[PDB]
Every structure is written in C-alpha cells, then in structure tokens.
Amino acid sequence: HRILIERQEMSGLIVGILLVPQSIAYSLLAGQEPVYGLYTSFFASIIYFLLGTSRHISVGIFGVLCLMIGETVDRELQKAGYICDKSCYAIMVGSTVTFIAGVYQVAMGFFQVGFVSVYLSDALLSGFVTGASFTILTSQAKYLLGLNLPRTNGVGSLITTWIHVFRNIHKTNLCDLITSLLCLLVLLPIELVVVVAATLASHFGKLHENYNSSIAGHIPTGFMPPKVPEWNLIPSVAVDAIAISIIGFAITVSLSEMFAKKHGYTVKANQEMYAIGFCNIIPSFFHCFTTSAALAKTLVKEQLSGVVTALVLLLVLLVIAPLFYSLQKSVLGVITIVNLRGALRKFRDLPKMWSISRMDTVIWFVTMLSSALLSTEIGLLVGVCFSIFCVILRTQKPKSSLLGLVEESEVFESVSAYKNLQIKPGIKIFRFVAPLYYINKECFKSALYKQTVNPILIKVAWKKAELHTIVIDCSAIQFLDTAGIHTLKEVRRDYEAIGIQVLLAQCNPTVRDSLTNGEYCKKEEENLLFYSVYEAMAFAEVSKN
Template sequence: MAKLCVGMAFALLTSVAPVYGLYTSFFPVVLYMLFGTGRHVSTGTFAVISLMTGSVVESLVPRPMGMNITNIQEAEIEKQRIAVASAVTLLSGLIMIAMFVLQLGVLSTYLSDPIVKAFTSGAAFHVTVSQLSTMLGLRLPRFTGLSTIFKTLGSIFRALGSTNIAELVISVVCLSVLIPTKEINSRFRRKLRIPIPIEIIMVMLATGISFATSLDQTYSIQVVGEIPAGFPDPQLPAVHSIPALVWDTLPITFVGYAVSVSLAMIYAEKHHYTINPNQELLAHGISNTVSSLFTCFPSSASLATTNILESAGGCTQLSGLFTSAVVLVVLLFVGPLFHFLPKAVLACINVISLRQMFLQFQDLPELWRLSKMDFMVWVVTWVAVVTLNAELGLAVGIVFSMMSVVCRTQRATCSVLGRASNTEIYRPVGGNSKCLEISGVKILAYNAPIYYGNKSFFRSALTRLLGLNQDKVLEGQDTQRENGVVNPASQLRTIQAVVIDCSGVIFIDAAGARLFVQMCTECQKGGTSVYLAQCNSGVLRILTHSGLLEHLSPQQIFVTVHDAVTHIEQTQENSAQKNATIWV
C-alpha cells in the first residue's frame, strides 16, 4: 500500500498527474518480476529519477503562470507533459537494451558508494525544496538549470505572504504524524510484524476529510483531481521530441541503473546470492520500453519500498506480483476515490520518504576514519549536486572520483623489501625489524601501475632509493671500459643487483614502458644488474615489445622474488670462487 502513496507523490516530482504514478507502480513491477535477478528489489517510482525527469518535462512543456487557462488547455498541457515523460522512459529503456547488447553492465562500477550516497542525499534536498511550495499552498513556477534550489527558495520567500493557511495546517499535521510514526517503524522493526502503514492511513483520512468539508472549494486547496478507473490505452510517446531528450536522458538512465544495481547487490550480499548486472540492464530496459507505451515515467529500484519489502519477508521476485495486484485493484476500482486527496499530503509523503537519504550524513564520521579521500569525494559530490543541479553534480562527482584515483596512483609508494631470516618471506623493511635487507641486493616493490601520469614519480623513487644519477652512470661506463674488464670496487659499491617486484604493477602503458626500459638500461650501465620478478603477462608483453630484452636476458626475469634472490646469491658465490687466489 505504501507503493500507492509514494507512486502518486512522486508523480508530482515528475510534473505529471498523480494517476501516472499509479501506472508506473504497476507496469514496470510486473516486467521486472519476469526479467530481473534481484529477489528483494522493489521497482517503481524513485524520487531522484522523478525529480530529474520532472526537470526535463518543465523545460520542454512549462506550465503557464500568471494567466487563466481553461480546463481544455489544462488537459492539453497535461497530455503534452506525460508524452514527454513517456518519451524519456522509452529512450531510457532503449539505451539500457543497447547497453545490454554491448554488455556494458560494468559501467555501474564508476558510481562508487560515496558518489551514490552523496548524490542521493543531495538530490533529497532538491526534492524537499521543490515540495515546499505545494506544502505552503503556493502556485509557483518550477525552475530548471543551475542553482535551482536557490532560485526556488528565493521564489518561496518572496511569496510567503500568499501562503494558503489551510494547506500549511494540513502539511504541519501530516508531518507531525508521519515523522514519529516512521521513527517507531524504524526503531521497533523487529517487534512489529508489519510496519504501520501510516501513508495509506493518512491518505484515507485526508481524502475523507477533504471530501466531507469541501476543502478544495472552501479554502482553495489543491487536490489530486480526476483519476480515471481502468488501464490507459497503449499509445506512442512524443517520439518527435526524442532528439531533444538524448543528453537529458543519459544521466537519468545511468543513475537509475546504477542505483538499482547497487541496491540489488546490497541485498544479494546480505542474503547470500548473486545478481547479473547485464541481465539487470535488460530487465530495466524492457520495463521502461514497454511501460512507456502506457504513459509511465522512468522507473528504477526504490530504497524505501525495497526496505519495506524485505522487512515484510519478501524473498523472491514473485513478491512483486502481490504488490502489483494491490495496485491493479486500485486502478480498476478505487482510483476515483482519491479525487479529493490534497496535494499537500502527497508532498509531505514525498519529503518523509527521503528519510533514509538524509540519514546518510551519519556515515560521514566513519567514512572520515576509513578514507579521507572517499570523504572528500562524498563532500564534493554533495556540494556540487546541491549548488548546481543533479546532473552536473553527478558529473562533477564522477570526475573528482576518477581524479582521486589518478592522484592515489601518482603518489604510490616504492618499498624496499627485506627477507625474514631463514624464510622465503619478503616484506617492507620500514616497519618490520625482522625483515632485513640482503647485502649487495636492493629489492624494490612499486605498488601501482606505471603510466604517463606517474612515470616521473616512479623515476624519482628509483633514483632516490638506488642513489642513481648521471655521474654514477658515466662512472660505471668508464670502469667497465678500463682494460676491457669490470672493476668491482668502482661499481655502485653498495648495490650490485636490483630486484624489482612487479606484483603491484597491474598494468603499464607505452610511456611507462619506455621509462622502465630506460631505468633498467641506466642501472646496467652503472654496473648494477637488474632482475624482474612476478610480472604479469600483460606487463611483460608490453615491456618486451618496448625493447626490454635488448638490455636484459630472459634469465633475469623470475616468477618469484625469492627465485631472483637465490639466483643472485649463487651468481655472487660463483664469482667469488672464480676470483679467489689459492696460495700453495
């Protein structure tokens, strides 16, 4: 039953009539039940997706302000609005199906947990501010573009003198009932067999009181209006507007899919099963494509209703069948009874449904302790979403997150490894006194990929740790030319061999490979032998193509660090025996 109220409430965010929220709470649910892999996921309307779609609808079909329009004109505007919203749904579904064909489910990984949580939390502020005008009974235009929160707040403050007291009272009463009841449901969720259905109770009471007292006529409050019984006739969306919708639909599609998959993965991990991200693309793609023919706006997984579904014991996709049956009964028989439901009640339900998103601020102290960089990603994304808009804020968050990854790889550490006594274990010597460096051998481990962005850091790290500079390279070359033999005393006296542990180098690009080969060459010219260990096949292939084997022999590449060290020790021992002088 909560899905009914939330569906009608989120239709207001989409700037369409509440009845279309009921349609969106039915058709996508049935289709996802057939094709989806998330057993606990409840699909349908979602506040963030509705808000983003509403911005598109408002930009293409703005509602005339400051002028009287007839009922016929109002109906025509409503028809155009749902046609645009359905076109967004169709295009979103087709994009998801195309992504499924291309097996692009992996793209959801670019939205990390800090980005998703900060984005949804920031979008919750947009939703709350957008509902203030309805809760106060103000007839204000809906703003689009940059800084919509500040534009909306400014418009509300300027119009506060026109507040409808009746709708303000309705909003205050609703919030004073919804907030404590939601808190009770949360605190005593284990003791309550089913959560208190406060939304449907509030809707029924408000509708009954509004009908009995004719609040819409007496106090000019906004009501839901006519909700036709039955199903809508299938019809094509506004296909002609699709070219103008492409760039606005892409973030809607990406966010809807990412939130749905993230939610499905959370519950799959909790209940010990797996989902298929690419199959989820197909499921949501089909859901949106087909439901667009029945005047639905874009759908995705819903945080609030998914939590309710799991608390009620739902554990398979068939649970969607029962929720759909309830919506079906309302569509066929009960829908017209909601005619007198005040829109202020739906606005309050909208705001309260975002409770979990606002509570995500509680994760910040723990995130600060775990990773300050992830904390910065969260804060930057949230600030960008709130101050700019949802789409640009998401883009800023993704770019900043990727830049943070680049920064982390640039500042990667190059560790000096030592060997634990009488073992084959090699660990950094800095914090472990039991691991000691081997005389004459320097073992280095670089814990990052080597690419154009960090190659200079890699070079400086090796130069510093090996004491390698141009003078020593030239000195090594001169001593090797002296009498055609190598003078050991004139080599880099403390380091005869370098072992580079490449286990942390997961990839290397062309620029990094050229530098790597150059560093190996400089070490060899300086009289220091270079050995590689634990190179993966991809890294070794690129190094080989970059000319590594022109300076190193295959015998200098080993599977493990210990194999390389053992070979070096045997070589040094054999060399010492050959150079030894026996006096008779």
C-alpha cells in the same frame, strides 16, 4: 646460481496503499497529472510479475527517476512553449523519454554490453541518491509552506528555490503549514492512517474554502487510447534517456543482486536488464513516464505479492479514486520528506565510511555536492568521471620503500613499515607498489634517486672532478607502458655508466614480454631478469666477490 623455467607454448496491500499517496506526488514532482503516476505503478507491477527474476523488489516509480524525467519535461516545455494543451504535451514528452530509455536498456541487455554498470561503485550511487533526496526536499518545500514560487530549472536550482522561499517566506496559507506540522509530528501503517485522517479532515472541514491547495479529482479509469509516442521529439530527449536508462538499470541490478545475496542468490543480471527494459516500453505506450527499482518501497515491502499491489492500484483506479481527491498537497510533501529520511540517514554513518577508506568518502561528498547544488545529470557525470580520476591519483603518488630480509626466511618486507630488518651493505632493494607508466614515471625515477644514490648528480660531480648493485622488485608492477620501457632502459644505462648493476626481480610474464619487445634484455645478455628477490640478491653477493 639461477633457476631455469620454460614457458608454455499478503503484504502487497500495505505497499499498494502506500503507493497511492506516494505517487500523486512522485507524479506532481514529475510534472504530470496524478493519475498517470498510478498508471505507472500499476503497469510496472503487472509487467514485472509477468517477467522478472528479483523475487524480492518493488519496481515502479523511483524518486530520482521521476525528478530526472520531470526536469526533462520542464526543459522540453520551455523549449516548445506549450489538443496538446499543458498536461497532455508533457505526458507525451515523458512517454517518449520512457520509450527511448527502454529501447536503450533492451539494446544494452541484448548486446551483452551491460558492463557499463560497473562504473558506479555504490558510493557514487549513495552520494547521487542523497543529492537527489535533497533536491526533492527543496522541491516539496513549497508544498510544505503552501507557497507559490515560480518554476526554476538548471544549475543552481536548489539555491534559487531556497532564495525565492526566503524572498516570500510570508504570505503563506497558514493552514497547509499547520496540517503539515500535524502530519510531521504524527509521522515522526502510519502513513495509511495519516492519509486517511488528512482526507477525512479535508473533506469534512472544507479546507480548500480557505485557499488551501489540494489534489483535484483525477479522471478515474480512462486512458483508453494507447497513444503511441510522437517520435518527433526523439532527438531532443535521447541524451537525457541515456542517463535515465543507465541509472535505472544499474539501481535495479544492484538492488536485485543485494537481495539475492541476502538469500536465494538466483538473480541473473541480463534477465533483469531485459525486464527493466520491457518495464519502460510496453507501459510507455500506455501513458507512463518511467520505471525503476524503488529503494524505499523495497524497504516497505521487506513477486506474487506485487500483484496484490497492482490489484489495490486497480481498485484505486476503478472506484477508490474519488476517496483520495480534495487532499492537501502538504500531506504529500511530508510523506515525501519522511520517505527521503531513509536516504538522508546516510549522513549519520559518515565517520564509518571515513574510517574504512578516505578516498571513497571524498568521492561520496563530491558526488553529493555535484548532485545537489548543480543539476542531477551533471552531478552523476561528475561522480563517474571523478571516481575514474581517483584511481589515476592513487597511481600518481605510489608507496615506495626499501626492502629488508626477514631472519631465517626468504620473506622480503618493507623497512619503512617493518622493524628489525637486515640489509647488507652495498645492496639496496627498491619496491614500487604502483604500476609504472607515463603518469608516475617521474615519481618512480625521483623515489629511486632519493632512496638510493642519484646517478646523474654523481656522474656530473665526477665529470667536474659503496652501493654496487640495485635490485628493483617489480612484483607489484602490473603493466609497463612505452614510457615505462624507456624509463627502465634509461635507469639501467645511467646506473651502468656510474658503475652500478641494476637487477629486475619477480617480473610479471606480461612485463617480461614488454621488456623483451623493447629490447631491454638485448640478446640473451642474462644477469638482468630474475625470478625472485632472493636469487637476484644472492647473485649480487656473489658478483661483488
């Protein structure tokens, strides 16, 4: 009773006016002069308009990217202790990091090795974004309170800044706090009106006369010399540029793909990789720090309209620049806070994530904690690795149950999950859902010994002094590592020694090849491998009689 089978041989003005206040900071947070953030936004929009495929996205300054480049800039400053002065040296450092990141992105795009973008899960990404949003929140807290705490960096930056704030809660400006409260209650085209009102009030009332920290005049136009990167700092920033490029292009391709799935569906991942690479090389020579697809802006916008944004930026870089100076830094802080509100709202729908899948929620929380309390790069690395390990954990504990026959059908279901299932005596069909390899080898052996009889104990009892065949269903066993071949041979040998016959059913072609290479089936011994659970069970029934 066997079957023989043979194998084969426009709206841009809004964003453009939202980007002006949304840069000074993302530039101040980045630790550079405010006009250079505007340079970054302008060059990013212009470059993406020249070449790009998203057709609905706002590439440019990305909070998290600015935070990472700022952390790298601060570390390089502390290492060097810095013509170069202060702003210029940091700006060159940022440009060097940008050039290296763009080179990495373009190399990955050309090599077609962009598969490294699949290790992010979007849950790791949401957690990482939320952690960075909290980090930006604490960074802007000192502008919110008009404080003057010393610069801090490294693991535990969040808690260190918070405890410094607690140390000198007092001795504030008390005008920045008041205007921050006013801007907060207004915010909760609102941003444009808010910045206009704040600028008008600061200019009319002479806020800086009361020691209120405000934005100084940023040099209009300028930037005439296209200073190339120094390239001596290349080794000192390469490791940071790796993570910067990975995050930037992964977020860009994710946003492009999601918007294309919304409509159009014409986004080519390799083309976006090329575009984000050239959005970090050509601008890098033009005093820029980074570029990536911005989550919030994209929401504000929702690529010709992008040109409009650039135009507005150019106007702000041509004649509207003095209209924006002498503006209190607290307004930039509250603007940053209300833009991070969008990423912060992900907390509200935490139960929805918990209901769908628990391990993902656990990965999300672990990534959040590692990317907020610890450093950003360490947080992302902890996230990617934790996700890879979680896949391993699912294999280590694997569903395993006996199988029962469904009446008037050949369907074999799980008796531990489905009721009214018939099992004839002397036949036990074991089912192991996960792959069998070195990790769950002991678990597979223990589960089989528990559901069925234990051959070793019964043999030792016999030496001191019902069930006759076992049908091991391998339908769900995707691969069998060297340890698996040995485990299966050992199981068969023990059960043969006790007096039981072990039958393998529904084996994958790959598992069949692995068993054949391991000499499990000997030389056409037969009665060991079967193509269906039903056929093997009927064969056992015949063999018993």
